[PDB]
Design a binder for this molecule. Structure first.
Ligand code: FAD
Ligand code: 245
Length: 467
Protein backbone atom coordinates (compact mmCIF):
# COMPACT_ATOMS: atom_id res chain seq x y z
CA UNK A 1 0.00 0.00 0.00
CA UNK A 2 2.79 2.46 1.04
CA UNK A 3 1.86 6.05 0.16
CA UNK A 4 -1.23 4.83 -1.74
CA UNK A 5 -4.82 4.53 -0.46
CA UNK A 6 -7.13 1.45 -0.52
CA UNK A 7 -10.70 2.79 -1.06
CA UNK A 8 -14.09 1.08 -0.50
CA UNK A 9 -16.04 4.34 -1.30
CA UNK A 10 -19.35 3.50 -3.06
CA UNK A 11 -18.74 5.86 -6.05
CA UNK A 12 -15.16 4.57 -6.63
CA UNK A 13 -16.39 0.91 -6.55
CA UNK A 14 -19.22 1.83 -9.00
CA UNK A 15 -16.82 3.50 -11.51
CA UNK A 16 -14.35 0.56 -11.24
CA UNK A 17 -17.14 -1.98 -11.91
CA UNK A 18 -18.14 -0.44 -15.28
CA UNK A 19 -16.65 0.55 -18.65
CA UNK A 20 -17.51 2.31 -21.94
CA UNK A 21 -19.02 -0.93 -23.35
CA UNK A 22 -21.67 -0.52 -20.62
CA UNK A 23 -22.44 -4.27 -20.29
CA UNK A 24 -19.68 -5.94 -18.14
CA UNK A 25 -20.17 -5.18 -14.42
CA UNK A 26 -17.67 -7.28 -12.33
CA UNK A 27 -17.28 -5.55 -8.94
CA UNK A 28 -13.93 -5.16 -7.07
CA UNK A 29 -13.44 -5.57 -3.28
CA UNK A 30 -11.53 -2.21 -3.32
CA UNK A 31 -10.10 0.60 -5.54
CA UNK A 32 -6.41 1.45 -5.00
CA UNK A 33 -5.26 5.09 -5.38
CA UNK A 34 -1.42 5.01 -5.72
CA UNK A 35 0.88 7.98 -5.06
CA UNK A 36 3.81 6.39 -7.00
CA UNK A 37 5.04 3.14 -8.75
CA UNK A 38 6.31 1.59 -5.46
CA UNK A 39 2.71 1.68 -4.14
CA UNK A 40 1.45 -0.36 -7.18
CA UNK A 41 4.44 -2.78 -6.60
CA UNK A 42 3.44 -3.15 -2.91
CA UNK A 43 -0.20 -3.88 -3.79
CA UNK A 44 0.65 -6.42 -6.58
CA UNK A 45 3.35 -8.02 -4.36
CA UNK A 46 0.73 -8.48 -1.57
CA UNK A 47 -1.69 -10.10 -4.10
CA UNK A 48 1.13 -12.45 -5.26
CA UNK A 49 2.07 -13.38 -1.62
CA UNK A 50 -1.55 -13.86 -0.35
CA UNK A 51 -3.07 -17.38 0.15
CA UNK A 52 -6.06 -16.85 -2.24
CA UNK A 53 -4.33 -14.45 -4.70
CA UNK A 54 -6.85 -11.65 -5.33
CA UNK A 55 -7.16 -10.16 -8.87
CA UNK A 56 -5.44 -6.85 -9.53
CA UNK A 57 -6.29 -4.81 -12.63
CA UNK A 58 -5.19 -1.33 -13.68
CA UNK A 59 -7.87 1.05 -14.99
CA UNK A 60 -7.07 3.98 -17.28
CA UNK A 61 -10.09 5.94 -18.49
CA UNK A 62 -12.31 2.79 -18.51
CA UNK A 63 -12.69 2.75 -22.33
CA UNK A 64 -12.76 -1.07 -22.54
CA UNK A 65 -15.82 -2.71 -24.21
CA UNK A 66 -16.03 -6.03 -22.38
CA UNK A 67 -14.72 -5.75 -18.80
CA UNK A 68 -10.96 -5.87 -19.66
CA UNK A 69 -10.07 -3.50 -16.75
CA UNK A 70 -12.37 -5.21 -14.19
CA UNK A 71 -11.10 -7.27 -11.21
CA UNK A 72 -13.96 -9.41 -9.80
CA UNK A 73 -13.60 -9.64 -6.01
CA UNK A 74 -10.15 -8.04 -6.23
CA UNK A 75 -8.51 -4.62 -6.48
CA UNK A 76 -8.80 -2.10 -9.34
CA UNK A 77 -5.80 0.28 -9.50
CA UNK A 78 -7.17 3.71 -10.53
CA UNK A 79 -4.13 4.74 -12.62
CA UNK A 80 -5.71 7.85 -14.25
CA UNK A 81 -6.91 9.69 -11.10
CA UNK A 82 -4.85 12.87 -10.51
CA UNK A 83 -2.21 12.37 -7.75
CA UNK A 84 -2.22 15.94 -6.32
CA UNK A 85 -0.08 19.13 -6.51
CA UNK A 86 3.21 17.38 -5.59
CA UNK A 87 2.72 14.85 -8.43
CA UNK A 88 1.96 17.56 -11.10
CA UNK A 89 5.16 19.56 -10.18
CA UNK A 90 7.17 16.26 -10.22
CA UNK A 91 6.20 15.35 -13.81
CA UNK A 92 9.30 14.98 -16.01
CA UNK A 93 10.24 17.65 -18.57
CA UNK A 94 10.92 16.49 -22.20
CA UNK A 95 14.59 15.52 -22.61
CA UNK A 96 16.80 15.75 -25.74
CA UNK A 97 19.01 12.78 -26.77
CA UNK A 98 21.81 13.14 -29.39
CA UNK A 99 21.76 9.29 -29.71
CA UNK A 100 17.98 9.13 -30.46
CA UNK A 101 18.17 12.29 -32.61
CA UNK A 102 15.28 13.99 -30.80
CA UNK A 103 13.26 14.43 -27.61
CA UNK A 104 11.41 12.00 -25.38
CA UNK A 105 9.26 12.43 -22.25
CA UNK A 106 8.67 10.14 -19.25
CA UNK A 107 5.02 9.91 -18.27
CA UNK A 108 3.07 8.15 -15.51
CA UNK A 109 1.39 4.96 -16.89
CA UNK A 110 -2.04 6.40 -16.05
CA UNK A 111 -1.52 9.78 -17.80
CA UNK A 112 -4.17 10.63 -20.40
CA UNK A 113 -2.86 11.38 -23.88
CA UNK A 114 -4.65 14.81 -23.75
CA UNK A 115 -2.55 15.67 -20.65
CA UNK A 116 0.67 14.30 -22.26
CA UNK A 117 -0.04 16.59 -25.26
CA UNK A 118 -0.69 19.73 -23.15
CA UNK A 119 2.43 19.09 -21.09
CA UNK A 120 4.80 18.53 -24.09
CA UNK A 121 3.40 21.52 -26.09
CA UNK A 122 3.93 23.76 -23.02
CA UNK A 123 7.55 22.52 -22.70
CA UNK A 124 9.08 23.18 -26.13
CA UNK A 125 6.16 22.92 -28.59
CA UNK A 126 6.71 19.14 -28.72
CA UNK A 127 4.20 16.35 -29.15
CA UNK A 128 3.78 12.55 -29.57
CA UNK A 129 4.03 11.49 -33.25
CA UNK A 130 1.33 8.79 -33.24
CA UNK A 131 -2.18 9.13 -31.83
CA UNK A 132 -5.54 7.51 -31.14
CA UNK A 133 -8.66 9.31 -32.46
CA UNK A 134 -9.65 9.97 -28.82
CA UNK A 135 -7.18 11.63 -26.41
CA UNK A 136 -8.95 10.81 -23.10
CA UNK A 137 -7.37 7.29 -23.06
CA UNK A 138 -4.46 6.33 -20.80
CA UNK A 139 -0.95 5.79 -22.03
CA UNK A 140 -0.81 2.38 -20.25
CA UNK A 141 -4.22 1.40 -21.68
CA UNK A 142 -3.31 2.21 -25.33
CA UNK A 143 0.19 0.74 -25.11
CA UNK A 144 -1.36 -2.51 -23.83
CA UNK A 145 -3.29 -2.71 -27.21
CA UNK A 146 -1.45 -0.73 -29.98
CA UNK A 147 -2.85 2.81 -30.12
CA UNK A 148 -3.89 3.60 -33.70
CA UNK A 149 -5.04 6.59 -35.76
CA UNK A 150 -4.41 8.23 -39.14
CA UNK A 151 -0.66 8.67 -38.42
CA UNK A 152 0.06 4.92 -37.84
CA UNK A 153 0.66 4.20 -41.58
CA UNK A 154 3.79 6.47 -41.32
CA UNK A 155 4.93 6.48 -37.66
CA UNK A 156 3.55 3.09 -36.68
CA UNK A 157 1.11 2.62 -33.77
CA UNK A 158 1.80 4.12 -30.31
CA UNK A 159 3.62 0.85 -29.37
CA UNK A 160 6.22 1.71 -32.08
CA UNK A 161 6.88 5.19 -30.50
CA UNK A 162 7.94 4.25 -26.94
CA UNK A 163 11.61 3.91 -25.91
CA UNK A 164 11.33 2.45 -22.47
CA UNK A 165 8.91 1.38 -19.73
CA UNK A 166 8.82 0.76 -16.00
CA UNK A 167 6.61 -2.31 -15.42
CA UNK A 168 5.24 -3.69 -12.12
CA UNK A 169 5.15 -7.48 -12.88
CA UNK A 170 2.56 -10.02 -11.58
CA UNK A 171 5.13 -10.67 -8.78
CA UNK A 172 5.17 -7.00 -7.70
CA UNK A 173 8.71 -6.44 -9.03
CA UNK A 174 9.48 -3.01 -10.59
CA UNK A 175 11.35 -3.72 -13.87
CA UNK A 176 12.77 -1.10 -16.28
CA UNK A 177 12.68 -2.40 -19.84
CA UNK A 178 13.33 -1.40 -23.49
CA UNK A 179 14.66 -2.90 -26.75
CA UNK A 180 18.14 -3.20 -25.08
CA UNK A 181 17.11 -3.89 -21.44
CA UNK A 182 14.87 -6.86 -20.40
CA UNK A 183 13.51 -6.89 -24.05
CA UNK A 184 11.25 -9.95 -23.40
CA UNK A 185 9.22 -7.95 -20.87
CA UNK A 186 9.25 -4.73 -23.00
CA UNK A 187 7.96 -6.40 -26.19
CA UNK A 188 5.68 -8.71 -24.12
CA UNK A 189 3.91 -5.74 -22.43
CA UNK A 190 3.52 -3.68 -25.65
CA UNK A 191 0.23 -4.98 -27.07
CA UNK A 192 0.18 -7.53 -24.22
CA UNK A 193 -3.38 -6.80 -22.96
CA UNK A 194 -2.05 -6.04 -19.43
CA UNK A 195 -1.03 -9.73 -19.02
CA UNK A 196 2.61 -9.27 -17.85
CA UNK A 197 2.46 -6.20 -15.63
CA UNK A 198 1.23 -2.66 -14.98
CA UNK A 199 3.06 0.14 -16.86
CA UNK A 200 3.97 2.83 -14.28
CA UNK A 201 6.23 4.80 -16.62
CA UNK A 202 6.44 5.18 -20.34
CA UNK A 203 9.12 7.04 -22.29
CA UNK A 204 7.31 8.52 -25.31
CA UNK A 205 8.98 9.66 -28.52
CA UNK A 206 8.27 13.30 -29.48
CA UNK A 207 8.47 15.53 -32.57
CA UNK A 208 8.22 19.34 -33.07
CA UNK A 209 4.44 19.79 -33.29
CA UNK A 210 2.79 21.53 -36.23
CA UNK A 211 0.60 24.59 -35.42
CA UNK A 212 -2.26 24.03 -37.89
CA UNK A 213 -4.03 21.36 -39.92
CA UNK A 214 -5.78 21.47 -43.32
CA UNK A 215 -8.48 18.82 -42.68
CA UNK A 216 -9.99 17.29 -45.89
CA UNK A 217 -12.88 14.90 -46.62
CA UNK A 218 -13.78 13.62 -50.11
CA UNK A 219 -16.49 11.23 -51.35
CA UNK A 220 -16.32 7.98 -53.34
CA UNK A 221 -18.97 5.55 -54.68
CA UNK A 222 -16.38 3.16 -56.21
CA UNK A 223 -14.81 1.02 -53.41
CA UNK A 224 -11.98 -0.26 -55.67
CA UNK A 225 -11.02 3.40 -56.36
CA UNK A 226 -11.48 4.47 -52.72
CA UNK A 227 -9.15 1.66 -51.48
CA UNK A 228 -6.67 2.15 -54.36
CA UNK A 229 -6.44 5.83 -53.29
CA UNK A 230 -6.02 5.09 -49.52
CA UNK A 231 -3.32 2.45 -50.40
CA UNK A 232 -1.51 4.89 -52.70
CA UNK A 233 -1.60 7.62 -49.98
CA UNK A 234 -0.17 5.31 -47.24
CA UNK A 235 2.75 4.34 -49.62
CA UNK A 236 3.95 7.97 -49.69
CA UNK A 237 6.52 9.59 -47.38
CA UNK A 238 9.31 6.98 -47.60
CA UNK A 239 12.42 9.09 -46.87
CA UNK A 240 10.34 12.07 -45.63
CA UNK A 241 8.81 12.86 -49.05
CA UNK A 242 5.48 14.59 -49.91
CA UNK A 243 2.44 12.93 -48.24
CA UNK A 244 -0.67 13.63 -46.14
CA UNK A 245 0.01 13.54 -42.34
CA UNK A 246 -3.11 11.57 -41.48
CA UNK A 247 -5.07 9.05 -43.58
CA UNK A 248 -8.44 7.61 -42.42
CA UNK A 249 -11.80 6.84 -44.01
CA UNK A 250 -15.31 5.81 -43.12
CA UNK A 251 -18.42 4.22 -44.68
CA UNK A 252 -21.19 6.83 -45.31
CA UNK A 253 -24.90 6.16 -44.44
CA UNK A 254 -26.65 7.23 -47.67
CA UNK A 255 -25.40 2.13 -53.43
CA UNK A 256 -22.75 2.67 -50.71
CA UNK A 257 -20.56 5.78 -50.28
CA UNK A 258 -17.11 6.03 -48.71
CA UNK A 259 -15.38 9.04 -47.30
CA UNK A 260 -11.63 9.57 -47.45
CA UNK A 261 -10.30 11.72 -44.63
CA UNK A 262 -6.81 13.24 -44.81
CA UNK A 263 -4.85 16.11 -43.21
CA UNK A 264 -1.83 18.22 -44.09
CA UNK A 265 0.09 19.60 -41.08
CA UNK A 266 1.77 22.99 -41.22
CA UNK A 267 3.41 25.83 -39.28
CA UNK A 268 4.62 29.43 -40.04
CA UNK A 269 7.62 28.10 -42.09
CA UNK A 270 5.42 25.76 -44.26
CA UNK A 271 2.18 27.87 -44.51
CA UNK A 272 3.37 29.13 -47.93
CA UNK A 273 3.57 25.57 -49.41
CA UNK A 274 0.35 23.91 -47.95
CA UNK A 275 -2.08 24.92 -50.73
CA UNK A 276 0.25 23.71 -53.55
CA UNK A 277 1.12 20.48 -51.62
CA UNK A 278 -2.61 19.72 -50.97
CA UNK A 279 -3.58 20.48 -54.65
CA UNK A 280 -0.79 18.22 -56.00
CA UNK A 281 -1.78 15.35 -53.63
CA UNK A 282 -5.55 15.80 -54.41
CA UNK A 283 -4.91 16.09 -58.18
CA UNK A 284 -3.54 12.51 -58.15
CA UNK A 285 -6.80 11.18 -56.50
CA UNK A 286 -9.99 9.67 -57.99
CA UNK A 287 -12.73 11.00 -55.61
CA UNK A 288 -16.17 12.12 -56.92
CA UNK A 289 -15.63 15.61 -58.48
CA UNK A 290 -16.88 18.52 -56.35
CA UNK A 291 -17.14 16.46 -53.11
CA UNK A 292 -14.08 17.96 -51.34
CA UNK A 293 -14.91 19.49 -47.93
CA UNK A 294 -11.99 21.34 -46.29
CA UNK A 295 -11.52 22.94 -42.85
CA UNK A 296 -8.46 24.73 -41.51
CA UNK A 297 -7.83 24.57 -37.73
CA UNK A 298 -5.22 24.42 -34.91
CA UNK A 299 -3.42 21.09 -34.44
CA UNK A 300 -4.82 20.56 -30.86
CA UNK A 301 -8.42 21.15 -32.05
CA UNK A 302 -8.07 18.54 -34.80
CA UNK A 303 -6.55 16.05 -32.29
CA UNK A 304 -9.38 16.61 -29.83
CA UNK A 305 -12.23 16.45 -32.44
CA UNK A 306 -13.74 13.24 -30.85
CA UNK A 307 -13.86 14.88 -27.36
CA UNK A 308 -15.85 17.78 -28.98
CA UNK A 309 -18.31 15.13 -30.36
CA UNK A 310 -18.43 13.48 -26.85
CA UNK A 311 -19.54 16.77 -25.13
CA UNK A 312 -22.35 17.13 -27.75
CA UNK A 313 -23.41 13.43 -27.25
CA UNK A 314 -23.31 13.71 -23.38
CA UNK A 315 -25.67 16.79 -23.55
CA UNK A 316 -28.15 14.64 -25.53
CA UNK A 317 -27.74 11.61 -23.17
CA UNK A 318 -26.19 9.63 -26.10
CA UNK A 319 -22.67 8.96 -24.68
CA UNK A 320 -23.38 6.74 -21.62
CA UNK A 321 -25.11 3.92 -23.56
CA UNK A 322 -24.02 0.29 -24.44
CA UNK A 323 -21.21 0.20 -27.08
CA UNK A 324 -21.01 -3.26 -28.74
CA UNK A 325 -17.94 -2.33 -30.77
CA UNK A 326 -16.10 -4.68 -33.12
CA UNK A 327 -12.65 -3.69 -34.40
CA UNK A 328 -10.99 -5.82 -37.05
CA UNK A 329 -7.65 -5.88 -38.83
CA UNK A 330 -8.46 -7.05 -42.39
CA UNK A 331 -5.83 -8.11 -45.00
CA UNK A 332 -5.80 -5.69 -47.98
CA UNK A 333 -5.94 -8.72 -50.34
CA UNK A 334 -9.44 -9.54 -49.00
CA UNK A 335 -10.76 -5.95 -48.39
CA UNK A 336 -12.92 -6.00 -51.65
CA UNK A 337 -14.43 -9.36 -50.52
CA UNK A 338 -15.05 -7.75 -47.04
CA UNK A 339 -16.84 -4.76 -48.60
CA UNK A 340 -19.03 -7.12 -50.73
CA UNK A 341 -19.77 -9.57 -47.91
CA UNK A 342 -20.19 -7.01 -45.08
CA UNK A 343 -20.87 -3.40 -46.16
CA UNK A 344 -23.03 -4.67 -49.06
CA UNK A 345 -23.96 -8.14 -47.72
CA UNK A 346 -24.41 -8.28 -43.89
CA UNK A 347 -25.29 -4.53 -43.75
CA UNK A 348 -27.18 -4.68 -47.09
CA UNK A 349 -26.06 -1.18 -48.12
CA UNK A 350 -27.79 0.65 -45.22
CA UNK A 351 -25.17 1.54 -42.54
CA UNK A 352 -27.31 3.24 -40.77
CA UNK A 353 -27.70 -0.48 -39.85
CA UNK A 354 -24.28 -0.35 -38.14
CA UNK A 355 -25.53 1.80 -35.22
CA UNK A 356 -22.69 4.33 -35.51
CA UNK A 357 -19.46 5.21 -37.43
CA UNK A 358 -17.71 2.51 -39.46
CA UNK A 359 -14.04 3.50 -39.91
CA UNK A 360 -11.97 1.98 -42.63
CA UNK A 361 -8.32 2.73 -43.39
CA UNK A 362 -5.09 0.85 -44.26
CA UNK A 363 -1.76 0.64 -42.36
CA UNK A 364 1.81 -0.56 -43.14
CA UNK A 365 2.83 -3.63 -41.12
CA UNK A 366 6.57 -2.79 -41.45
CA UNK A 367 5.93 0.14 -39.02
CA UNK A 368 4.89 -2.47 -36.37
CA UNK A 369 7.66 -4.28 -34.50
CA UNK A 370 7.28 -8.08 -35.08
CA UNK A 371 8.59 -8.68 -31.50
CA UNK A 372 5.58 -7.08 -29.77
CA UNK A 373 2.53 -9.01 -28.45
CA UNK A 374 0.23 -7.16 -30.92
CA UNK A 375 -1.65 -9.46 -33.32
CA UNK A 376 -1.89 -8.32 -36.92
CA UNK A 377 -2.93 -10.14 -40.15
CA UNK A 378 -0.28 -12.21 -41.98
CA UNK A 379 0.03 -9.55 -44.75
CA UNK A 380 2.01 -6.26 -45.28
CA UNK A 381 -0.95 -3.91 -45.83
CA UNK A 382 -4.04 -4.45 -43.66
CA UNK A 383 -7.05 -2.28 -42.78
CA UNK A 384 -8.62 -1.29 -39.58
CA UNK A 385 -12.40 -1.79 -39.95
CA UNK A 386 -14.00 -0.27 -36.85
CA UNK A 387 -17.72 -0.82 -36.11
CA UNK A 388 -18.21 1.90 -33.53
CA UNK A 389 -21.76 0.99 -32.67
CA UNK A 390 -23.98 2.59 -30.08
CA UNK A 391 -27.11 0.71 -28.88
CA UNK A 392 -30.27 2.72 -28.09
CA UNK A 393 -30.55 3.21 -24.30
CA UNK A 394 -33.21 1.21 -22.44
CA UNK A 395 -33.73 -0.86 -25.68
CA UNK A 396 -32.47 -4.49 -25.06
CA UNK A 397 -33.39 -5.48 -28.65
CA UNK A 398 -31.00 -2.83 -30.06
CA UNK A 399 -27.98 -4.38 -28.19
CA UNK A 400 -29.11 -7.94 -29.20
CA UNK A 401 -29.32 -6.94 -32.93
CA UNK A 402 -25.90 -5.22 -32.92
CA UNK A 403 -24.27 -8.23 -31.10
CA UNK A 404 -25.80 -10.56 -33.74
CA UNK A 405 -24.46 -8.33 -36.55
CA UNK A 406 -20.93 -8.60 -34.91
CA UNK A 407 -21.25 -12.44 -34.84
CA UNK A 408 -22.38 -12.54 -38.53
CA UNK A 409 -19.31 -10.43 -39.56
CA UNK A 410 -17.00 -12.79 -37.58
CA UNK A 411 -18.71 -15.89 -39.07
CA UNK A 412 -18.37 -14.35 -42.61
CA UNK A 413 -14.61 -13.82 -42.10
CA UNK A 414 -14.08 -17.37 -40.71
CA UNK A 415 -16.30 -18.96 -43.39
CA UNK A 416 -14.60 -17.26 -46.39
CA UNK A 417 -11.08 -17.62 -44.84
CA UNK A 418 -10.47 -13.81 -44.72
CA UNK A 419 -7.60 -14.01 -42.19
CA UNK A 420 -8.87 -11.01 -40.19
CA UNK A 421 -7.72 -10.42 -36.58
CA UNK A 422 -9.68 -8.68 -33.85
CA UNK A 423 -8.08 -5.53 -32.41
CA UNK A 424 -9.02 -5.12 -28.64
CA UNK A 425 -10.00 -8.88 -28.71
CA UNK A 426 -12.88 -10.15 -26.62
CA UNK A 427 -12.43 -13.91 -27.38
CA UNK A 428 -12.51 -15.29 -23.74
CA UNK A 429 -12.61 -19.04 -24.94
CA UNK A 430 -9.23 -20.99 -24.98
CA UNK A 431 -9.17 -22.50 -28.54
CA UNK A 432 -10.21 -19.05 -29.95
CA UNK A 433 -7.22 -17.36 -28.20
CA UNK A 434 -4.94 -20.09 -29.73
CA UNK A 435 -6.36 -19.34 -33.24
CA UNK A 436 -6.16 -15.52 -32.58
CA UNK A 437 -2.41 -15.69 -31.73
CA UNK A 438 -1.44 -18.71 -33.90
CA UNK A 439 0.91 -21.54 -32.72
CA UNK A 440 4.24 -19.61 -32.54
CA UNK A 441 2.76 -16.47 -30.88
CA UNK A 442 0.54 -18.38 -28.39
CA UNK A 443 3.57 -20.41 -27.17
CA UNK A 444 5.55 -17.17 -26.69
CA UNK A 445 2.53 -15.49 -24.88
CA UNK A 446 2.01 -18.49 -22.45
CA UNK A 447 5.80 -18.54 -21.68
CA UNK A 448 5.75 -14.79 -20.85
CA UNK A 449 2.71 -15.34 -18.57
CA UNK A 450 4.47 -18.19 -16.68
CA UNK A 451 7.51 -15.89 -16.20
CA UNK A 452 5.77 -12.54 -15.39
CA UNK A 453 2.34 -13.41 -13.89
CA UNK A 454 2.36 -17.17 -12.96
CA UNK A 455 -0.65 -16.71 -10.59
CA UNK A 456 -2.71 -14.93 -13.39
CA UNK A 457 -3.45 -12.01 -10.99
CA UNK A 458 -3.28 -9.29 -13.68
CA UNK A 459 -5.86 -8.11 -16.17
CA UNK A 460 -8.06 -11.19 -15.52
CA UNK A 461 -10.94 -9.31 -17.24
CA UNK A 462 -9.27 -10.09 -20.61
CA UNK A 463 -10.27 -13.76 -19.95
CA UNK A 464 -7.13 -15.43 -21.35
CA UNK A 465 -5.64 -17.23 -18.30
CA UNK A 466 -7.38 -18.85 -15.32
CA UNK A 467 -7.00 -16.57 -12.23
C1 FAD B 1 -13.85 4.47 -25.68
C2 FAD B 1 -12.93 4.76 -26.84
C3 FAD B 1 -11.86 3.90 -27.08
C4 FAD B 1 -10.99 4.10 -28.16
C5 FAD B 1 -11.20 5.20 -29.01
C6 FAD B 1 -12.28 6.06 -28.77
C7 FAD B 1 -13.14 5.87 -27.70
C8 FAD B 1 -14.30 6.82 -27.49
N1 FAD B 1 -10.36 5.47 -30.09
C9 FAD B 1 -9.34 4.67 -30.28
C10 FAD B 1 -8.45 4.93 -31.42
O1 FAD B 1 -8.66 5.75 -32.29
N2 FAD B 1 -7.37 4.07 -31.51
C11 FAD B 1 -7.09 3.00 -30.64
O2 FAD B 1 -6.10 2.29 -30.83
N3 FAD B 1 -7.96 2.75 -29.61
C12 FAD B 1 -9.03 3.52 -29.45
N4 FAD B 1 -9.90 3.24 -28.43
C13 FAD B 1 -9.73 1.99 -27.67
C14 FAD B 1 -8.76 2.21 -26.50
O3 FAD B 1 -7.42 2.19 -26.98
C15 FAD B 1 -8.97 1.06 -25.51
O4 FAD B 1 -10.24 1.17 -24.87
C16 FAD B 1 -7.86 0.91 -24.47
O5 FAD B 1 -8.25 -0.09 -23.53
C17 FAD B 1 -7.46 2.19 -23.77
O6 FAD B 1 -8.50 2.73 -22.95
P1 FAD B 1 -8.14 3.03 -21.39
O7 FAD B 1 -6.90 3.81 -21.20
O8 FAD B 1 -9.42 3.62 -20.83
O9 FAD B 1 -7.77 1.73 -20.58
P2 FAD B 1 -8.71 0.61 -19.87
O10 FAD B 1 -9.89 0.43 -20.74
O11 FAD B 1 -9.02 1.03 -18.44
O12 FAD B 1 -7.84 -0.72 -19.75
C18 FAD B 1 -7.49 -1.45 -20.96
C19 FAD B 1 -6.71 -2.70 -20.61
O13 FAD B 1 -5.35 -2.35 -20.26
C20 FAD B 1 -5.12 -2.61 -18.88
N5 FAD B 1 -4.38 -1.48 -18.34
C21 FAD B 1 -4.84 -0.23 -18.04
N6 FAD B 1 -3.91 0.61 -17.64
C22 FAD B 1 -2.75 -0.16 -17.68
C23 FAD B 1 -1.41 0.13 -17.34
N7 FAD B 1 -1.00 1.31 -16.87
N8 FAD B 1 -0.50 -0.86 -17.49
C24 FAD B 1 -0.91 -2.05 -17.94
N9 FAD B 1 -2.14 -2.45 -18.27
C25 FAD B 1 -3.03 -1.45 -18.11
C26 FAD B 1 -6.49 -2.87 -18.24
O14 FAD B 1 -6.42 -3.66 -17.06
C27 FAD B 1 -7.24 -3.50 -19.42
O15 FAD B 1 -6.93 -4.88 -19.56
O1 245 C 1 -13.21 5.14 -31.71
C1 245 C 1 -12.47 5.43 -32.64
N1 245 C 1 -11.44 4.58 -33.09
C2 245 C 1 -11.10 3.30 -32.62
C3 245 C 1 -11.79 2.67 -31.58
C4 245 C 1 -11.41 1.36 -31.20
C5 245 C 1 -10.35 0.72 -31.89
C6 245 C 1 -9.70 1.33 -32.97
C7 245 C 1 -10.10 2.63 -33.37
N2 245 C 1 -12.57 6.68 -33.35
C8 245 C 1 -13.59 7.59 -33.29
C9 245 C 1 -13.76 8.45 -34.36
C10 245 C 1 -14.87 9.31 -34.37
N3 245 C 1 -15.82 9.22 -33.44
C11 245 C 1 -15.73 8.37 -32.44
CL1 245 C 1 -16.92 8.27 -31.18
C12 245 C 1 -14.66 7.51 -32.34
Amino acid sequence: VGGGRLSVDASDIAEASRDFGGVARAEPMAVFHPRAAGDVAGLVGAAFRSARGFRVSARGHGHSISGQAQAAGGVVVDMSRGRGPGAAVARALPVHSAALGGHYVDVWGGELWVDVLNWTLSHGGLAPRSWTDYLYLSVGGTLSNAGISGQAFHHGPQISNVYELDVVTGKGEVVTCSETENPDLFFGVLGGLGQFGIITRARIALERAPKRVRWIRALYSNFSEFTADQERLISLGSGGGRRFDYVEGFVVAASVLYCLEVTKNYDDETAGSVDQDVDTLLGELNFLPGTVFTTDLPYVDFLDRVHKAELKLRAKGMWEVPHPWLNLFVPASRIADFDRGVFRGVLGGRTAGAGGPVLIYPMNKHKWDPRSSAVTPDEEVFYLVAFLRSALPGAPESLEALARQNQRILDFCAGTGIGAKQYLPGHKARHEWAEHFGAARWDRFARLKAEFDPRAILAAGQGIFRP
